[model samples]
Target: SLTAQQSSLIREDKSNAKLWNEVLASRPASGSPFQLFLSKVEETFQCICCQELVFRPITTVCQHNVCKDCLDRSFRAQVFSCPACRYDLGRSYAMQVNQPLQTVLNQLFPGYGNGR
Candidate 1:
């Protein structure tokens, strides 16, 4: 006796590819409880300025988090201030990537940045 298996592949466009990558990366390695944990972590990762999940996150002295691109956009507009609050970042303030959070995110969602 012989058995046959059937399968199909669907090609994804750029935007859909990015979305699927993010979803796959964030999916729990095991199951439900961990999935809930991922959801909570994602909530904390929301960028204040864009109100979306952060990409290249930056943490300010005021303890607010913003995406690097959002910060750059504000700077380009000559608004050197925290988006979450009115706390000033000053013109010369250095914007550094929030390494710890980034590391945690990378671990939780492998290949998350591949979308970006």
Candidate 2:
């Protein structure tokens, strides 16, 4: 009695519910790819020079974020380039937070980067 379109919609609806249930039933952890990616990003988000979450994080021309203090310190140390990707960010810069992505991250993995 069902058309192909209706049947396909029913299948997708069922699959979507199942996926939501699976996500709801589980907590994010380090070994899973999602958790691993989160961990890697969190790890790199800390500034190497100050060993802290980057303050005034600047994105370089090659798309790497580094703390202003750290980059300046690197220049003092004669490493005048992006630490992560060697991209030139230049001396003058403005910092901006990727708020939506950060919000989603905080929502998906609360207390991320706070512990082992």
Candidate 3:
């Protein structure tokens, strides 16, 4: 489970995808919907580690989502925290390439993975 508060952020990311898809078809961004409802989120999809929007996010044992590359460096440090709340991710924690969130971001932000 995510943090009691962080849970809301995840919830928003989940629902925003659907709501946005509808908005995309309706108001129609040609691509403008990303700017429409997504702009004001204070901490929507940006990773806590790299401080960039997550690409290929690695979901932590503690349930925070971080960019795969950012989490890669923590393994160099030998011990990793969840990054957002610093919950002990411990040594030997395998990074799970959170495909769910990855797909979500990919669709939510166009060509988002290309930024990596």
Q: Which candidate number would show the highest lDDT if scored against the true structure?
A: 1
lDDT for each residue of candidate 2 in 5-104, tens digit (9 for 90 to 100) = 4334334433234422343343334355556444544565566566766455554555555666677678777766678777655564444543433443
Ranking by lDDT: 1, 3, 2
Better structure of 2 and 3 per TM-score: 3
Cα deviation of 116 in candidate 3 (Å)? 1.2
Each prediction's RMSD over C-alphas, in Å, is 12.7, 12.4, 8.9
Poorest stretch of ten by lDDT in candidate 2:
13-22
Model 1, range 1-116, lDDT digits (tens) per residue?
A: 10121001102212223332443354344566556656765776688887877777787777767889899999999999899897988997888776655655666677877755
Point out where model 1 deviates above 4 Å. 1-31
Task: Give Cα-based local distance difference scores for all models.
Answer: 0.65, 0.51, 0.62
TM-score per prediction, in order, is 0.67, 0.39, 0.63
Query: In model 1, what lDDT does residue 70 have?
Result: 90
Task: Flag regions of model 3 displaced more than 4 Å.
Answer: 1-36, 40-42
